[PDB]
Every structure is written in C-alpha cells, then in structure tokens.
Write a protein that binds this ligand. Structure first.
Ligand SMILES: *[C@@H](C)[C@H]1/C(=C/c2[nH]c(/C=C3N=C(/C=C4\NC(=O)C(CC)=C4C)C(C)=C\3CCC(=O)O)c(CCC(=O)O)c2C)NC(=O)[C@@H]1C
Ligand SMILES: *[C@@H](C)[C@H]1/C(=C/c2[nH]c(/C=C3N=C(/C=C4\NC(=O)C(CC)=C4C)C(C)=C\3CCC(=O)O)c(CCC(=O)O)c2C)NC(=O)[C@@H]1C
Ligand SMILES: *[C@@H](C)[C@H]1/C(=C/c2[nH]c(/C=C3N=C(/C=C4\NC(=O)C(CC)=C4C)C(C)=C\3CCC(=O)O)c(CCC(=O)O)c2C)NC(=O)[C@@H]1C
Ligand SMILES: *[C@H](C)[C@H]1/C(=C/c2[nH]c(/C=C3N=C(/C=C4\NC(=O)C(CC)=C4C)C(C)=C\3CCC(=O)O)c(CCC(=O)O)c2C)NC(=O)[C@@H]1C
Ligand SMILES: *[C@H](C)[C@H]1/C(=C/c2[nH]c(/C=C3N=C(/C=C4\NC(=O)C(CC)=C4C)C(C)=C\3CCC(=O)O)c(CCC(=O)O)c2C)NC(=O)[C@@H]1C
Ligand SMILES: *[C@H](C)[C@H]1/C(=C/c2[nH]c(/C=C3N=C(/C=C4\NC(=O)C(CC)=C4C)C(C)=C\3CCC(=O)O)c(CCC(=O)O)c2C)NC(=O)[C@@H]1C
Ligand SMILES: *[C@H](C)[C@H]1/C(=C/c2[nH]c(/C=C3N=C(/C=C4\NC(=O)C(CC)=C4C)C(C)=C\3CCC(=O)O)c(CCC(=O)O)c2C)NC(=O)[C@@H]1C
Lengths: 161, 160, 5, 198, 160, 160, 161, 160, 161, 160, 161
C-alpha cells in the first residue's frame, strides 16, 4: 500500500532521480487537499452506519434480491452484504485519505471478482449499491469531497465490473 | 508517511481513523510547506553536498582512497559518491514524507550485510553521512538543519 | 473347537 | 538506462515481496489493564483466526467468557487462540465445509501464519485429525514449538513471509492472496515426492 | 436437523455416532409423525395465528406503531407481518427438521446486525414470536404444544 | 488525555516519544486555554443545551415518550435527560483531555450490551447526541464548535 | 464434574462395586425429579433475559452502585455485571439440570472470590442480585423448582461469600 | 450422563440447551426406570455372564490360554475374568448413565496402550465383549437387549 | 494508565460532577509544568543512550557485579541489565511527561519483585544504578526537571524495595 | 545414511556441516569395508539365521502356532517368516547406511497400528528380532556382533 | 532427501531384492569419492562468503538490476539476493556431499521458478550468478572436486530454467 506522497517517492525512486517540480506541485496539491480529506474522514466516520443504512434503503430493499431466491435473502447473507458495504465505505475512506487506489487494488479488488462469481453475488446490484453509497456521501460530505469519494467508489465499481 | 501509518493501524484494528490521528495528519499537512522547502534546498544543493562531504570524508579517512582500499580508483570513488547521492536522495525522501520510513525501507535494511559482502567500512560510511549532515547544517538554516539532522542521525544510528 | 485354518 | 515508461514505473515500484510484510500491526497484549487494548487484541484475534470480524456469523458472542478471562489475565493470548480454535464456530466454519487436507491448510494459515512445511507435517496433522480430530489438532499447532518461537504467549498470530523451506513462501502467498470462501480447491494438496521411498 | 447436528459433532470429535445418539435419531424417527402434524396444522392456520400475534403486539407495544416508529406505517406494519410470517416459516422448518439448525442457519445468524441496520427492536420481534407461541398454545392441541412452544422458547431466548 | 495516548503509542512500538508527537503536546499545553473556555462554556450552559437536545430528540422520535416507549413515564424521561447529561460531561472530559480515550473508557465500551439489556433504542441515543452536538454548535463560536465536533462525532460514531 | 448420576457412579467406583440400594434410591429420585428439571429449564430458557432485567431493576438499578462511585458505574463495568448475572443464571440452570453443584463450583467459581476482592466488586450487592434472581425465578417456574434453583443460587452466594 | 453430554454441548455453544436437548433429557427421565431395571438384571445375573462368556471365549480362541501365553494358568484366567467383571460393571455404569462417557473415562481411554504394555490382544478382548453381548442378549429381553447391545456395540467399536 | 489530567477527570467522575475551579487550577498547573516536561523529555530522547552509559560507568563497571561470579557477568546478562536500565529510563521519562506514576506500577512494578527474586537479580545494585541515572539526569537536564525525574525514579526504587 | 542424517541436521540448523560431522563422514567412508563385509555375510547366510530364529521363536512362544493364533498353519507361518526376511533386509540396509533412518522410513513407522490391525503380538515380534540378534552374535565376530546388534537393538526398541 | 547410498538402497527396494554385487560396487565407488567430497565440502564451508562475494562482484554489480528500479537495488533486496546465493551454495555443497541431485528438487527447486516469476526476479541473472558461483568454486577446489559442484550448480540452473 502507498498513499500519494509515498507513491511520488517510489516513482522517483524507480526513476532514480530526485524530486523535480512535478513531484513538488503534486505534493502541494495533496497538502492543499489534506484538510478536505480530514474533514470528510470525520464526517464519514461519524455517519458510517447511517450512510450504509440509507444506501441499502434506496438501493436494494423490497426487491427481488431481498426476496427468497435472491442473494440478500436470509439474515446471514443480509448481514454479510451489510458488512460488504461497510468494507467498501471504509476502504473508500482509506483511499480518500491516501490519495491513491493501491489499498483498493491490493486489499479489496484482489480476488473479489472470482470470490463473488463463486458465491453467486449479483455484481450489478452490488455496483448500484456502491452508487447509492456514492450519492449518500456526496449529499452528506459536500460536492468536492463527495467527488473524490465518488471517484474512489467508482474505481471500486470498475474493478468489480 | 504518517498517513500510511495511520491507515495501516486503522485497517489492522478494522476501524476508522481516530480524531487524534486526523489531527496528526492535519499537523503533518501544515508542516508540509516547510518540509518541501527543506527538500528543495537539499535538491538544489545536491552536487555540492556530496562533493564537499566526499572531500572531507577522504581527508578524515585517507585509507579508503589509498591503494589497496575499497575506494581507490576513480570508478570506485565515483561509486562512493554515488552511494552518498543515494543516501542524500533518501534523506530528501524522508524529509518530504515526514518520517524515516522510506529511508529505512529502501536503504537501511540489510545495509550491514551489503557492505560486509562488499568489504566496505560501514563506520566510514556513517562518518560520510555525518559529513553530509555537517555540510547540510552549514549551508542550511538552523531549524531546517535540526529537521534534516534528525533523519541524518537516524541514518548514522542505523549504520553504526 | 472349530479352529478354522 | 532507458526512459522507464509509466507501466514499468508501476511494475517496478511494487517489485519484490509485497509491502504488507512491513505495513501491518503486530498485536501484543503488553498489559491487561488497558481494556481498550485488550478489546483491540481480542478483535484482532477474531480477525486472524476466522479471517473476518465475526458479526455476521454469530448470534451472540460465544467467546465472552474467554474475553473475560483474558481481561482478568488468568489465561494468555495463546490460550485465547486455543479456545477460538477449539470453539464451535471454528468447526462450523473451517472444518465442516472442507476436507481434512484443507483443514490442515486453513489451520496452518490461521494459527502458524504460513502454509504447511512438508509432507511429514501433513502426515502428522492427518494423524491427529484421524485419531482425535480438530481439538487436538488445534492444540498441537498452538502448543507446538514453532508457534512459541514465532509468536509466544502474548502475541496474536499474523501473516508470515517465510524464506525456508522450498515452496513455503509461494504456497503461503497463494493461501493469503485469496479471500475467505473464494475457492474450494487445495492450495497445497500434497508435496510430490521426488524419491518414491519403498 | 438433529441428525446433521449430531453428525457434525461426531465428525469434529473424530468418531462414529455414539449409541445414545443413534438411539435418539431412532426416537426422532419413531416420533416424527406428530411433528408432521404440527407442521400441517401451522401451514393450515398460518394466517389467523399471525393475525392474532400481530394484533396483540400492536395492543401491547403502541410505540412500535406510534408516529416516528420504525413500524409506524401501513407499509411498515405489512413488512412487520412479513417478518412474522418468516419466523413462522422458520418454526415450521424447525419442527420438521427436529432441531434448531434451520432457524439458526436462516433467520438468526446476523439478525442483530440486520435489525440494527434497520433500526428495529429485537426485543419487540422476540415479543412477537412469543405471542405466536401463546396463540399457538391456545389454538393447537396440548401435547404437541410442548414441542412447538418449546421451539418457540428457543427462538425467543436466542433472539431476545 | 492526548499525552496518555502519545505515551501508549510510543510504548507500543518502544519509542522515546518522538518530536512528531511532542510538538503536538506542546501545542496542546499552549492552546489549552481555548479548550478550557469550551469546557466552562459547556458547563455553564449544560442544562439549556440538554433540554433543547431532548426537545429535538422527542421531536424526531416520539416513540420513546409514547406509552409503549422506553422513556415513558416522566421518570424514564428524566433518566433520558440524565444519561444525556452524563454524555455531555463525558464530552467535556474529552475536550479537556485532548483525545477520545476518557469517553471510550467511561461510556462507550459495552454501551451496546447495556442498552440491549435496558431495551432502549441506541440509534435514538445516537440521535440525541447528534441534537446535543447541533445545539452546542449553535451556542458556540464556529471553530470552537468544530473543535468540540470531533469529540461529539466520536460519540455518535461509536454509539451507532 | 459430577452430576447426580455420575456422582453415584464415582462413589461406586471409589470403592469398586456395583449399584447398591442407595444407588437405586438416588437414581430413582433423579428419575422422578427429571421432568420438573426439564420443565424448569424450558421456562428459564424461554425468558432468560427477563430474570436478569427485572432482577437488576428491583435490586441494583437507581442505587449508589450504578451511581458514580459505585462499581456498576461506567458502561464496561455495567455490561460486565450483566454478563456475570447471565453467567450465574445459566450455570444455575445448568446445575439444576445436572442435579449437583460440582459443575457450579468447577466452572463459575474458579477464582471468583479473589477476583472480586482484587477488583473491588461488592459481594453483598452481588448477593442481593442473586436474591432478586431467586425471587423472579421462583415467580417464573414455581415453588419447588424455584427453591431447588435457589439452593444452587445460594451456593453461588456462598462461593462469593 | 446424557445430561452431561448435552450440557457440555450447550456450554460449548455458550447458551442454554436447545429443546432437542431438553427432549433428550425428557425421554431419558422417562426411560430411566427401564434402564435401571436392565442394569439390575445384569447386576443380579452377572456371574453367569462373565463365566459363560469366558468359557466360550476360551473355546473360540484357545491360543490365549495356551502355555506361554498371557492368559495361561489359573492365576492368569482369574485376572482375565476380573477384567471381564470390570468391563461388565462398566457397561452397567454406561446403562445407568445413559451415555458412554463414564465407559470412556474409566476403561476406554488409554486401553490400547494399557493392553500393549500388558501384552494383551485387544482383538481377543473385542471377541470377549462380543460373547458378552451374545450371552446378555440370550438371557435378556429383546427390546432391552437392543440398548444393551448398543452399549456393548460402542465398547466393541472403541476397543477393537 | 492515567496522568494528572486523567486523575483530575477521574476525581471529578467518582462523584460524577462537572469540573470546577479547583480542577481548572490543577489543569493550568499541569499546562505550566508541560513546558519543562516537554523540554526535559526532548533532551532525554536526544541523548538517552549516553546517560545510561555514564550511569553504568559510575555505578556498575569495575565492580564485583561485573566481575566473574557477579550477576552482571557474561555478555547476555550485561546486555539484559543495560536493557533494563533503558526500560527504567524510558518509563521514568513516560512518568515524568505524564505527571503521574501510574505507568510505573502498571507496566513495570507488577511481577518485577518476583521475577528478580526468581532470577537472582541484585536489588541493591539495581537501586544504585537507578541512583546513577537520577544524578546523571539531574546534572544533565537541570534542577527542577532533574528532581521531577528523580521523584519517579525513587518511586521505582521504592517499588523494587 | 549418516550422510543424509548429517545433512538433515545441518539443514535444520541452517548451516554448513560441522568439522565433527565431516570427520564422522570421513571415518564412515574409510571404515565402510567392514560394513560391506557384514552385508555380504548376511546376504549370503540369509537362510540359516532366520531358520534358527523362527525355530527358537516358535519353541519359546508357541501361542502363535497354537490354534486360534495369528499364524497357526504353515501359510501365515510363511508370511511371518517373510516379515522376518523383511526385517533382516532392513537391518542389512541400516548396516550399509550407517544410520537407522532407512529402517525407520521403510518398515518401522506405524508398526504399532500395523500390528494392531494384523493382530500380531508386538512383544513376540520383538522377541523374534532379539533371537535374530542372538543367532547373529553367534554367527559373526564380537565387534561385528556389536555393530550389527546396535541396529538390532534399535529395531527391538522401536518395535517394543 | 536422498544420496547415492540411499539411492542404491531404494533401487534395491523398488525391485524388491537384496543388495547384489553391482550395488556393492556403486557403494564402494561412493566410499572412494567420499574423501574428496568431504575435503571439498570443508573448503567451501570455510570460504563460502568469499565465493559468493567474488561471484556477485564478477556477475551482478554494475548492471541494470543494480541501477535503481532494478531487482538488485534496495539493500534489503540486495542482501536477500546474497542470502539466496548463500542458500544455493550451501545446498549445492549438501548435494556434492550427498551424491544425488534429489535435495535440489526436494528442498530448493520446489516452487522456486514460481517464486521468482511472482517476485519479478531475473532468471538469467540468477543463472549467470550460479555460473559465477560454479566458476569460482571450480577455481577454488580444483577441477576434479569442482566437477561435482559443476554438476549440482548446473542442475540448479536446469531446474530453474
Ligand atoms: C413488527 C413486530 C416488527 C417490525 C419489522 C420491520 N421489518 C422491516 C424490514 C425488513 N425485515 C427484514 C427481515 C428478514 N429478511 C429475511 O430474509 C428474513 C428471514 C430470514 C427476515 C426475518 C428485512 C430484510 C427488511 C428490510 C426490507 C425488507 O422488508 O426486505 C421493517 C422496515 C424497516 C425500514 O426502514 O424499511 C420493519 C419496520 N418492526 C418492529 O419493530 C418489529 C421488529
Ligand atoms: C582494546 C584493543 C579493545 C577494547 C576493549 C575495551 N573493553 C572495555 C570495557 C569492558 N569490557 C567488558 C567485557 C566483558 N565482561 C564480561 O563479563 C565478558 C564476557 C566474559 C566480557 C567480554 C566490560 C564489562 C567492560 C566494562 C569495564 C568493566 O570491566 O567493568 C574498555 C573500557 C571502556 C570504558 O569506558 O571503561 C575497553 C577500552 N576497545 C577497543 O577499541 C579494542 C577492541
Ligand atoms: C565511500 C562512500 C565508501 C564506499 C562505497 C562503495 N560502495 C560500493 C558499491 C555499492 N554500493 C551500493 C549501494 C546501494 N544499493 C542500494 O540499493 C542502496 C540504497 C539506495 C545503496 C546505498 C551498491 C549496489 C554497490 C554495488 C556496485 C554499484 O555501483 O551498484 C563501492 C564499490 C565496490 C566495488 O568493488 O565495486 C564502493 C567503493 N567504500 C568505502 O570504502 C567507503 C567507506
Ligand atoms: C452486498 C453488497 C451483496 C452481496 C454480498 C455478500 N457477500 C458475502 C460474503 C462475502 N463477502 C466477501 C467480501 C470481502 N471480504 C473481504 O475481506 C474484503 C475486502 C477487505 C471483501 C471485499 C467475502 C470474502 C465473502 C465470503 C465470506 C463470507 O462467508 O462472508 C455473502 C455471503 C455468501 C454466502 O454464501 O453466505 C453475500 C450474500 N450479495 C448480495 O446479493 C448483495 C447485493
Ligand atoms: C539473487 C541471485 C537474485 C535476486 C533474488 C531475490 N530473491 C528474493 C527473495 C526471496 N528468495 C526466495 C527464494 C528461496 N526460497 C527457498 O526456500 C530457496 C532455496 C533454499 C530459495 C532460493 C524467497 C522465498 C524469497 C522471498 C522471501 C524473502 O524475501 O526473504 C529477493 C527479495 C524480494 C524482496 O522484496 O525482499 C530478491 C531481490 N534478485 C536479483 O536481482 C538476483 C538475480
Ligand atoms: C434517553 C435519551 C434514551 C434512554 C435512556 C435511559 N437510560 C436508562 C437507564 C440507565 N442507563 C444508565 C447508564 C449510563 N449512561 C451513561 O451515560 C453512563 C455513564 C457513562 C451510565 C453508567 C443508567 C445509570 C441508567 C439508570 C439506572 C440506574 O440509575 O441505576 C433508562 C431507564 C430504563 C429503566 O428501565 O429504568 C432510560 C429510559 N432510553 C431511551 O429510550 C432513550 C433513547
Ligand atoms: C454484577 C453482579 C456485579 C459486578 C460485576 C463486575 N464484574 C466485573 C468483571 C469480571 N467478572 C468476571 C467473572 C467471570 N468471568 C468468567 O469467565 C466467568 C464464568 C463464565 C465469570 C463468573 C471476571 C473474570 C471479570 C474481570 C474481567 C472482565 O472485566 O470481564 C466487573 C468489572 C471490574 C473492572 O473494573 O474491570 C464488574 C463491575 N459489580 C457490581 O457492582 C455488581 C454487584
């Protein structure tokens, strides 16, 4: 795992050179965005459960996936799905703190495709649940912090698609 | 970085970041401007640091550039100066990242085994890093010298 | 006493 | 040399052993008076043994007596891990839907932190699994010499990155790079003997 | 099922089934017909039992249907009756299976996580299925009421 | 306290209390006048904010003051206001400590099991803390309210 | 642990003969009592939270123990006390079904007295909590089953005392 | 006892007994008088059981009592029939217990290592308890001999 | 553990009252002492190893303990003893920066008496070593901060005695 | 093989072979001529040694060839002498190897449960190999008897 | 694992007979070679740091892998490559002392190609490092003793290729 700063450091390390002006103003961009990321972290950490609650309410309740035969049927599978959305929200918050998607690459999307294919988990309904999380956190934390949270959740969607 | 450390700690505990960790990230962000100033100072003064530190290193330890030494030839002296350039680049990386994590992960694990296999005097490499610290404190301001000398003394302590 | 072989 | 294009930059940035070897926390119960640290170590032990937080797999906490004893410091973290292995949730989770070879794989991964070493170790754990079953298998793995030399009595087990012997690191990587219930086939079916003895 | 719980216990303990346990699957298969009678009378009278249980819950706990409540709405009472019928299905599955295994495997594992995601009172749904127990004891014959109400006692004790 | 948290984090990895936390301790002990002003403001206006928070809590969820509810009776409503006063005092303890560990030690470990045994809606307790946060933010002056908002948001996040 | 049956078996094995007349009388007594034990266990397991709920309500709530200064102040200590009372009720029901308190002083009384003396737990308040559990269980299960539950609960009171 | 097995399973899964298990205890405390009657018949007629079983064991396997053997001699046959009496008393203990765990914890844990140190063929003891259950079913009622052969059946399985 | 701040918070919480002017005075006294605590702890963290070097030089070197037959004989036991000195210096720094000696009897003094008695560690030589650290730190960091460190170092001495 | 054993120990200790182990391998490869002679001796005289061993075994322990025994008739008597031939060729393999490991991983691991499954007396097989040791000591020279008796003693010790 | 002598024993046991004259001839050939194997193993164990030092110096320094971004860069990875070559030399010494190349595919080559493929380790650079190892070893222990080292290091090359 690497954040934006250590991603810059490792890229310059493989380049074998010092930090040129591109590294410096990318670092200044991260230092500008850090206060926004901390405030969005505080808001999401305060409303971690409620974001998942309203997202699953507006995405996949009273539908065929919650019907018998659907994969959100039974309390075991329902609570597993809620824990999955909690994982997605927490790791999106981690990636929003980092400014990099390496944590989503190595700790989330690694094996998730064939795991859900082995489990029979509906990929499209999971993606639109993540979209519901995106809309709820965009309405909650603001437009720009919601936009970074949205692009990381859409990175999760594209990795899962 | 401390952001990476906080995300690792929160992921291992399976929780969101604490407000103390978020305030630590805020303080790191506010100190980032001075840290990038120190990094730009060292990056601009790159070649004179290694030149003056290598000259003072060879003054204090003439045996390594004597014949039969590990760094006698012109190519071997260039390899010495390249190692010092490597450690200066790692010191700038640590100054940017706010911690000793990139220095320790890139060029301080197994450094003793590496220099033992190369036959290189590790105490003289630590003396060289001390000379780099002294030249950096000479040409850089005193508080910036203290912040850079923190990482410099970390490198010296890991070598010694 | 069967003692079968 | 060369220009080092951006896909090559991304490839050689994460080149050797993955950075999760250094980017993890080792949970040691330093003192049992910090109840927050005790709870964090207990939940980390849950995550290590059952690979996840055990909220969607229980009714209530079956290990609450074990948590109380660990907070009282009349058992150790080693005995806590022993109880989690010799609990009903572990035989429901990693013993009931898997063959005993996969039980050996999962038990070594969860408790010893690494893949099984050799065919002698596989035959040994198969002997305990045939004779007394899962309880003595967990007891042998936990009270073995390797567990105590690695973790000790006060440390929650973690993912290991061994160098020796052969194939232990790739088999451990194949065990630890797949999620829970991702596949049902065997990562380490058996080690093929290069010498068919007898 | 009682056979699948006993065989999981024997499989974990690395032995054949104990002769007491074979004697008790023997007892279960000799006495199984009354369990089928319980299942068919609950399937016959599913709508009236859930009518009386829901009505007496709405009498006993008006906060559940009060404004601001989770089960305030006409819709919300309908999905409450859905959960009622789901637990009735689980009790019928359990009395057929002879054990608590389908109830715990379908509707008890993770149910606290689900109901705290939904904001619903778990003590109130335990009161609901307790009222299903008491009206089932009123409606159904006394000897089989012991087994049916006992499995109801299991689900109210496991849920509350 | 933040000093206690820094000591615990240094002791976990066996450090000597690095300047990266020692400057934070310096900033805390210099800027403690503002958080003491926050604490005395909350202590002086403690009753008004808890009464308005109970007002908005009963506005949003009048289930608990309904006759079936948990806070019904005017004694259990008094107990609701008393528990909210307890959590307000915990917030003041946290804002003089500098971190979240006294609120964690006193009122967040096992609060789920406590309110499960008491039958109260813990989500409504979290909503009460939300309304207390909002009333305290309205009463306080901007950045001071944002400083107390971290401790409040910790209480809601660990409550829910 | 020795129940009634295995206690008679162990007393037979310590002197090495078969089942005598006293063994017949004790086994017949347990045979007669077993239906009452099953009914009492079913009634307790039906409402297992409820004895704890009104026992703390009528014995420990709104007192100095749950006020600040007392040992049931703070949520961790309160949840510990509730979990202890559920432990005492469950192990008392267990000893009731067994017919002997060997399981009781073997499983729950391991170091409880010096543990509570080290922690400062009020032994008298714990005893009053067990008294409230005795009265509520006697209301729930009946008179004879209530008193043979209460003798094991009084054995718990002796174990702390 | 069967109550001990049920209570161990219930304590392992860390809640009260499932009504399957209370059904186990209920049917055991209905059938305990019959089980005690069977054990009393075996206790009263124990001597012909051990004597006839040992005689037909010696008829089936004369190698055991052949000279140089483990059981050769009046002394060794006396010790062997004392073992026969031990095993018969243990099976009566299993009958009055309702399970096989006193049988295990008295005579079936370490019995293989016991008879390997003694030089005793466990397959011959398995044939011995086969003739035990044959004579017991011969002089016992058929429904009673069903459970008697079940407990002897466990002895054969665990000790063979 | 607890510092002076947590001690003030707990002393308020045992009666369950809000903070009053005495608590404000204690907190302002701690904020006044925090300047010298931060400066002294920064000095100890800067030159911690040489303090242990001079302390063991003027306390334990060229003595019967480090001679053969002593308990500081062999390099393993010598490194263990100087590691114990590092432990005591680090925990004295922790207790000085906290302002309360709770970490000493929570994480140092518990079991140390029995451990040293089982291993034959010389208590008097350990106390003399701790005296060497306390005079070296008193000479090195100043008078008030030196005696403030020496208070908790003498608390460690009293715990070992 | 002693070379295999030394390599296994050096690999377990993660080091090269010690000079003591190297001196042991050198002494073994110098002294292997006597082991070659004993191998040729036992391979040539394989018949009469197991002749007299089986004969004296049957005259001291006739319970095997008693009726009801494992090898009563000459067919399983031939299989018993084939087992003895297997143990003798494993003893020769241990003699040529210099270490007991090929004996161990061909025919000594699991012999306990092997002969509990085949019903053979473990102490009788151990006594038979002891009589092989006796007749081999009669057949060969005293130092040769001692060095073959080391492997014979290993076999009887791990069998018994 | 297996050596020449246990290879003779296993080849006897596959066909099921005793050791014939050709088996004794192979054993005596091994006993004749054993003095040379022991002497070469002692020399390699004495000089094992020098062989890997000169081999890395003549095959691995001043290359693309040693320049930054390469696999030989990052001193942790550098010392790990040194430790890998130490393992190769030690197990080749084991094989030379043994007389059979079974320890390589039982304890070295098992999964080694998969390890290096997942690790991004340069296969031909490792192969030429092994070639430098066997050249230095053959120069040190002579041609005849270095012949067996050439056999087993080239066996490592053939397995790893
Ligand atoms: C009246 C006594 C109760 C009541 C209930 C209530 N339920 C819901 C909604 C849901 N209930 C479930 C439950 C299940 N899913 C399953 O698969 C099973 C059987 C294994 C059960 C029992 C689920 C998933 C939902 C979500 C949507 C859906 O209906 O599928 C609500 C609505 C909550 C909302 O916010 O919409 C309510 C109100 N209310 C009570 O107080 C009692 C608990
Ligand atoms: C001289 C060329 C070298 C040298 C040596 C040197 N050593 C010391 C000090 C000490 N050495 C020990 C050693 C041991 N004590 C043991 O019990 C054992 C194991 C048997 C050993 C190896 C100790 C304890 C000391 C401290 C003095 C004492 O004995 O109490 C010094 C003195 C340093 C000082 O500050 O006094 C010196 C000079 N130094 C070198 O550079 C050469 C390698
Ligand atoms: C003078 C400063 C001292 C000295 C240095 C010296 N070093 C080498 C050779 C190498 N040094 C490295 C170092 C690194 N690899 C890494 O990944 C990192 C972290 C960024 C470092 C610092 C390496 C790889 C080499 C190998 C050759 C190369 O050029 O890459 C030499 C040359 C030795 C030779 O014989 O080739 C020298 C001379 N030697 C001294 O005596 C001074 C103490
Ligand atoms: C919810 C959006 C949908 C869905 C979910 C669902 N998930 C599971 C089970 C698993 N989920 C994961 C995912 C992860 N584990 C991790 O550690 C990480 C990254 C940190 C991820 C992303 C895994 C591994 C499992 C399997 C383990 C388990 O049993 O929980 C289930 C259960 C499947 C079952 O057969 O029980 C479900 C139902 N499915 C849906 O329909 C929702 C739309
Ligand atoms: C050195 C010649 C080349 C090189 C290699 C390199 N290897 C590693 C790390 C590992 N090497 C192994 C290999 C083995 N496991 C075994 O059991 C055996 C036989 C005894 C071998 C040879 C393994 C498992 C690892 C991973 C575990 C570990 O790192 O300790 C690295 C390091 C990668 C890292 O990220 O640390 C490297 C660099 N690289 C080169 O350039 C040379 C060609
Ligand atoms: C009010 C917004 C909600 C709620 C409150 C409520 N609580 C109780 C009972 C008690 N809970 C405690 C425990 C504590 N709360 C704290 O903040 C702290 C300190 C950190 C503690 C220890 C206590 C002490 C009581 C009172 C019992 C006693 O004093 O001994 C009740 C009463 C329930 C009853 O049956 O008496 C109520 C009503 N309930 C709601 O419905 C609101 C959501
Ligand atoms: C409640 C009636 C009274 C009371 C209780 C109280 N208990 C604790 C803490 C502990 N309780 C136990 C007991 C057990 N652990 C077990 O595993 C079992 C059997 C299954 C029992 C009986 C233990 C070991 C502890 C210590 C560890 C822990 O906290 O879980 C506390 C907390 C004390 C503290 O400060 O941590 C309390 C308060 N106190 C009262 O006032 C009630 C009268």
């Amino acid at each position: 795992m690497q954040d934006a700063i250590t991603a810059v450091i490792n890229s310059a390390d493989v380049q074998g050179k010092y930090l040129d002006g591109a590294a410096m103003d990318k670092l200044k961009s991260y230092f500008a965005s850090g206060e926004l990321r901390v405030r969005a972290a505080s808001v999401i950490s305060a409303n971690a459960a409620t974001i998942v609650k309203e997202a699953v309410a507006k995405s996949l309740l009273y539908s065929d996936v919650t019907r018998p035969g659907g994969n959100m049927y039974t309390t075991r599978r329902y609570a597993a799905c809620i824990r999955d959305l909690d994982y997605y929200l927490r790791y999106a918050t981690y990636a929003m703190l980092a400014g990099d998607a390496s944590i989503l690459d190595e700790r989330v999307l690694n094996g998730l495709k064939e795991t859900y294919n082995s489990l029979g988990v509906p990929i499209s309904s999971t993606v639109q649940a993540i979209q519901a999380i995106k809309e709820v956190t965009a309405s909650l934390v603001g437009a720009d912090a919601g936009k970074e949270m949205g692009v990381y959740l859409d990175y999760i969607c594209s990795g899962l698609s | 970085s401390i952001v990476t450390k906080s995300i690792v700690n929160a992921d291992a505990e399976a929780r969101y970041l604490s407000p103390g960790e978020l305030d630590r990230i805020k303080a790191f962000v506010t100190g980032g401007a001075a840290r990038l100033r120190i990094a730009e100072t060292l990056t601009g003064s790159r070649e004179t640091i290694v030149k003056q530190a290598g000259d003072r290193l060879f003054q204090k330890r003439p045996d390594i550039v004597s014949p039969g030494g590990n760094a006698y030839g012109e190519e071997m002296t260039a390899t010495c100066l390249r190692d010092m350039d490597y450690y200066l680049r790692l010191v700038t990386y640590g100054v940017v990242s706010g911690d000793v994590t990139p220095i320790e992960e890139i060029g301080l694990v197994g450094v003793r085994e590496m220099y033992r296999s190369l036959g290189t005097p590790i105490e003289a490499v630590a003396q060289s890093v001390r000379e780099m610290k002294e030249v950096a404190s000479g040409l850089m301001s005193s508080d910036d010298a203290a912040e850079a000398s923190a990482y410099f003394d970390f490198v010296i302590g890991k070598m010694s | 006493w069967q003692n079968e072989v | 040399s060369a220009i080092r294009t951006e896909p090559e930059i991304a490839y050689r940035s994460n080149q050797g052993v993955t950075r999760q070897r250094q980017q993890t926390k080792v949970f040691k119960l330093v003192s049992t008076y910090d109840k927050v640290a005790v709870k964090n170590a207990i939940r980390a032990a849950y995550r290590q043994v059952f690979e996840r937080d055990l909220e969607p797999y229980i009714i209530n906490s079956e290990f609450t007596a074990l948590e109380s004893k660990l907070s009282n410091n009349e058992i150790n973290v080693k005995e806590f891990i022993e109880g989690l292995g010799t609990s009903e949730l572990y035989m429901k989770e990693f013993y009931a839907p898997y063959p005993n070879t996969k039980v050996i794989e999962m038990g070594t991964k969860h408790f010893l932190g690494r893949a099984p070493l050799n065919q002698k170790e596989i035959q040994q754990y198969n002997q305990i699994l045939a004779s007394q079953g899962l309880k003595a298998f967990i007891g042998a793995m936990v009270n073995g010499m390797e567990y105590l030399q690695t973790f000790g009595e006060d440390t929650v087990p973690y993912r290991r990155f061994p160098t020796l012997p052969a194939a232990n690191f790739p088999n451990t990587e194949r065990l630890y790079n797949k999620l829970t219930k991702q596949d049902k086939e065997l990562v380490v079916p058996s080690f093929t003997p290069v010498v068919k003895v007898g």
